[PDB]
Amino acid sequence: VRSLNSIVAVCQNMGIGKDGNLPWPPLRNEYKYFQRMTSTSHVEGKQNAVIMGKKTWFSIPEKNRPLKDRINIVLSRELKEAPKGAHYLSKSLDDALALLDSPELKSKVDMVWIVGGTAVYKAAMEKPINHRLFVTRILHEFESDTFFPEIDYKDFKLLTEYPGVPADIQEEDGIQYKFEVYQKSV
Numbered sequence: 001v002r003s004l005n006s007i008v009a010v011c012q013n014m015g016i017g018k019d020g021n022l023p024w025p026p027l028r029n030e031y032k033y034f035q036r037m038t039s040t041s042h043v044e045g046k047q048n049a050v051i052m053g054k055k056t057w058f059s060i061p062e063k064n065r066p067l068k069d070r071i072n073i074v075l076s077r078e079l080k081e082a083p084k085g086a087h088y089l090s091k092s093l094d095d096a097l098a099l100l101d102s103p104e105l106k107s108k109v110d111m112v113w114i115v116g117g118t119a120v121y122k123a124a125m126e127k128p129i130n131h132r133l134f135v136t137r138i139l140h141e142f143e144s145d146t147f148f149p150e151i152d153y154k155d156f157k158l159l160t161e162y163p164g165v166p167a168d169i170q171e172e173d174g175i176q177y178k179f180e181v182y183q184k185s186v
């Protein structure tokens, strides 16, 4: 795979989850952003793939699984078979990458998105491959029990602009947030 993309929303404490769910109540516009960015393919006949850990898969309401219009790959060292509704099960990020490179997948897949959690982000960030990280920074603090790993600011450079990503601070439900894009070139 030529390049990876990761997307996450974090609060001021770098928190991403609390008790199996998000630390903050629902933000409609943030959700729409995730859906659009991960579902949009730049090529006809192809779809994007999303890779996620097991607790992230089960955090999605059952009736909404798998994430529509994307090939869903779940990572787990314990499961024997892909959970009901998932397209593929992999035992490491490396296996999932290999999978994608395979014949069947290769022609069917456009972009690859990493959608969490912690260990999934961390493994993707360590690969010496071109990578774009789409971060939503929610400018408030919420209690969290699961955090985003540290990003190497020497490697991942913050872009000042990116096509189709609003620059300004956004606000919804009395909460402000900003979209940032960081890029690592390999």
Ligand SMILES: NC(=O)C1=CN([C@@H]2O[C@H](COP(=O)(O)OP(=O)(O)OC[C@H]3O[C@@H](n4cnc5c(N)ncnc54)[C@H](OP(=O)(O)O)[C@@H]3O)[C@@H](O)[C@H]2O)C=CC1
Residues within 6 Å of the ligand: 007, 008, 009, 010, 015, 016, 017, 018, 019, 020, 021, 022, 052, 053, 054, 055, 056, 057, 059, 075, 076, 077, 078, 079, 090, 091, 092, 093, 115, 116, 117, 118, 119, 120, 123, 146
């Ligand atoms: N704010 C945001 O952007 C996001 C927030 N969330 C939140 O994060 C939490 C879920 O995240 P987290 O707790 O970190 O869990 P994960 O979703 O990463 O699930 C962890 C499990 O996934 C498997 N796994 C994870 N990484 C790997 C790997 N590299 N290779 C193989 N298996 C792997 C293992 O399963 P096994 O034990 O079976 O081996 C591990 O126990 C929830 O609160 C969710 O709501 C999630 C995504 C994005």
Ligand SMILES: [Ca+2]
Residues within 6 Å of the ligand: 078
């Ligand atoms: Ca486990």
